[PDB]
């Protein structure tokens, strides 16, 4: 088949080791070869390839392209790709090149507007250009793809089983004034914390992640749901520590630690690993870890429960990584590993490879990042079969253990509380009065029915 002159149509230049390299040890997926690197021209060509569709390349490209190509430039490139000049045998060229390449362009626009609409929300002119382009597309073959794109565009500009019974302990429904770590039911604490943290996990989009934006000076602007999620986790860890060290009487503090291990147990049963690691981080903090007299009275079974949870974090999360691979939704993964891996993938690989003196976009690094964001999306799909309790949810949304203090002042206060309630040997252990009027016994972590 005979194409136009590269002079008139840039996407007609043949492949060479100066414009596209493939991965030479990866099995192709569905017969398609894996692109390693390429000029942006060649990456656009393969994004809209006439021989076949490549949905996985399209997904990866639209998720990661902003590091090497701006949105206005990508729009100009796929418009240029769509406008194919002709070089009889035109019937062949029209049938096997122009028409399938144009369908690919429309498919790329459709996926762009459907799954990456934030580009258009942040650049109205980009949306103006896209609507203009779609309006110029006049053909019988493209009519219903054009119409479907318009439908999407206009839209964007705007359980099977029943859940278990909610559990109650000392605090009664509607009595928020008494809600607290020991007065709410530990099962229900774990459940409502899992609902909050699952919503927090599900709201994080790839746009807050690619480009390692959450680590840069504009993170509050580009990664607000991610940051809200992390700050919830930090808050719960600090509330756990605070509840422990501000309970100065030893017996009561043992009750507090034991109730926190019970919440961890239910976190494990729910596959809320963010919750598990909130507890584990609390137990590993300087103020709590040193409380030898408290852990001494923790029953051995709960020691083993905590021990299993803590061991998930050992050896760079080896057991956590296996456990998560083996479980099925719904769950709430710990996000920190994703963030470290995206950051080090982006920082530890070159933006560009060089071949015969020519610069090529390093695409396989982007593919690796898009694998990580895809793993995250896969756990965002399934929700929990659990009922919200608005008042418990509200109580945990508004936990503010730090109050008005700065981080250092507050963690120094926790550490000094720890030293007061259990002084360094050889200072004798003092006694402290009880602070709780109600019974400390736990209802346990098995439902009432």
């Amino acid at each position: 088949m005979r194409l136009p002159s590269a002079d008139v149509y840039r996407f007609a230049e043949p492949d060479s080791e100066e414009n596209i390299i493939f991965e030479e040890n990866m099995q192709p997926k569905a017969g398609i070869p894996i692109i390693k690197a390429g000029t942006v021209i060649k990456l656009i060509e393969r994004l809209t390839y006439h021989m076949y569709a490549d949905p996985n390349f399209v997904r990866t490209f639209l998720t990661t392209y902003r590091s090497f190509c701006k949105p206005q430039e990508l729009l100009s490139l796929i418009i240029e790709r769509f406008e194919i000049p002709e070089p009889a045998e035109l019937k062949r060229f029209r049938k096997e090149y122009i028409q399938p390449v144009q369908l690919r362009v429309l498919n790329v626009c459709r996926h762009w507007v459907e799954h990456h609409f934030y580009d258009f929300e942040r650049d109205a002119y980009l949306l103006q250009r896209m609507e203009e382009f779609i309006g110029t597309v006049r053909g019988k073959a493209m009519k219903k793809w054009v119409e479907s794109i318009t439908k999407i565009i206009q839209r964007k500009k705007i359980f099977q089983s029943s859940p278990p019974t909610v559990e109650w302990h000392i605090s009664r429904p509607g009595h928020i004034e008494t809600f607290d770590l020991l007065t709410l039911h530990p099962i229900e604490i774990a459940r409502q914390l899992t609902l909050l943290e699952s919503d927090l996990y599900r709201a994080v989009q790839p746009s807050e992640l690619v480009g390692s934006v959450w680590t840069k000076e504009d993170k509050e602007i580009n990664s607000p749901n991610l940051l809200k999620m992390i700050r919830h986790t930090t808050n719960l860890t600090l509330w756990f520590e605070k509840c422990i060290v501000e309970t100065e009487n030893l017996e009561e503090r043992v009750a507090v630690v034991s109730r926190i291990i019970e919440i961890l147990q239910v976190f494990q049963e729910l596959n809320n690993f963010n919750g598990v690691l909130e507890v584990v981080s609390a137990m590993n903090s300087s103020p709590v870890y040193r409380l030898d007299h408290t852990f001494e009275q923790i029953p051995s079974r709960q020691k083993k429960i905590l021990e299993e949870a803590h061991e998930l974090s050992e050896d760079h999360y080896k057991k956590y990584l296996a456990k998560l691979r083996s479980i099925n939704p719904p769950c709430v993964p710990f996000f920190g590993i994703y963030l470290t891996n995206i950051l080090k993938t982006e920082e530890g690989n070159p933006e560009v490879l060089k071949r015969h003196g020519k610069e090529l976009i390093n695409f396989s690094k982007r593919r690796k990042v898009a694998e990580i964001t895809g793993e995250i999306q896969q756990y965002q799909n399934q929700p929990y079969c659990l009922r919200v309790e608005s008042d418990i949810k509200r109580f945990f949304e508004n936990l503010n253990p730090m109050g008005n203090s700065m981080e250092k002042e507050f963690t120094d206060y926790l550490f000094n509380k720890s030293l007061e309630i259990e002084p360094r040997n050889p200072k004798p252990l003092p006694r402290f009065p009880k602070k709780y009027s109600y019974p400390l016994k736990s209802p346990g972590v098995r439902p009432s029915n």
């Binding site: 137990m283 870890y289 040193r290 409380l291 030898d292 408290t294 852990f295 001494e296 923790i298 051995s300 020691k303 083993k304 905590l306 021990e307 803590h310």
Partner: peptide
Amino acid sequence: XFHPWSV
């Protein structure tokens, strides 16, 4: 030995 929660 080890962690305050090691049996």
